[PDB]
Amino acid sequence: ATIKLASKDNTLTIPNAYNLQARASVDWSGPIEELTARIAKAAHFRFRVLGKSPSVPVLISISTKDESLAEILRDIDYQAGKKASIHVYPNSQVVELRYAKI
């Protein structure tokens, strides 16, 4: 993915973190894992996927001229719905993509 740096509740799963406050412009759609990994790298966070990537990839779309990486991640998380979830660990600085694959 590529970013231009300038109902499920995810309050505890995706809390705020300093590096995720950074603002960015994003115009992209495609594999959730691709953009999520790009955001994590951009925010200096480790990225890891838990579970197994679904047969049919979870696609998401982000169109914003200015948004925080944190809000973009929450947008992406919602879009994934029951198909997957994003966890953000502020102390260890890890972004986790968990495929709810069962």
Author numbering: 37 to 42, 66 to 161
Any passages from the paper?
Intracellular replication of L. pneumophila requires functional Dot/Icm T4BSS, irrespectively of host species. It has been well established that L. pneumophila translocate more than 100 effector proteins into host cytoplasm using the Dot/Icm T4BSS. The complex is supposed to contain two outer membrane lipoproteins, DotC and DotD, two inner membrane-spanning proteins, DotF and DotG, and one outer membrane-associated protein, DotH. The outer membrane targeting of DotH depends on lipoproteins DotC and DotD, presumably in a manner analogous with the function of pilotin in targeting secretin inT2SS: the outer membrane lipoprotein pilotin is required for the stabilization and outer membrane targeting of the secretin. In conclusion, the present study revealed that the structurally conserved DotD/N0/T3S domain is widely spread throughout outer membrane complexes of even distantly related secretion systems, including T2SS, T3SS and T4BSS.
To clarify the structure and the molecular mechanism of Dot/Icm T4BSS, we crystallized DotD without the first 20 amino acids which contain the signal sequence for secretion across inner membranes and the lipidation site, Cys20 (DotDΔN), and determined the structure at 2.0 Å resolution. DotDΔN is composed of the compact C-terminal domain (DotD domain) and the N-terminal disordered region. The N-terminal third of DotDΔN was invisible in the electron density map, except for a short β-strand (Ala-37 to Ala-42) that we call the “lid. The DotD domain forms a βαβ sandwich fold composed of two α-helices flanked by an antiparallel three-stranded β-sheet on one side and a mixed three-stranded β-sheet on the other side. DaliLite database search showed that the DotD domain has striking structural similarity to the N-terminal subdomain of secretins, which are outer membrane pore-forming proteins of T2SS and T3SS. Thus the DotD domain and the N0/T3S domains of the type II/III secretins share remarkable structural homology, although they are poorly related in amino acid sequences. The most remarkable difference between DotD and the N0/T3S domains of secretins is that DotD has a lid that makes β-strand addition to β-strands β1 and β3. The lid is located on β1 and covers the hydrophobic cleft formed by α1, α2 and β1. The side chains of two hydrophobic residues in the lid (Ile-39 and Leu-41) stick into the cleft.
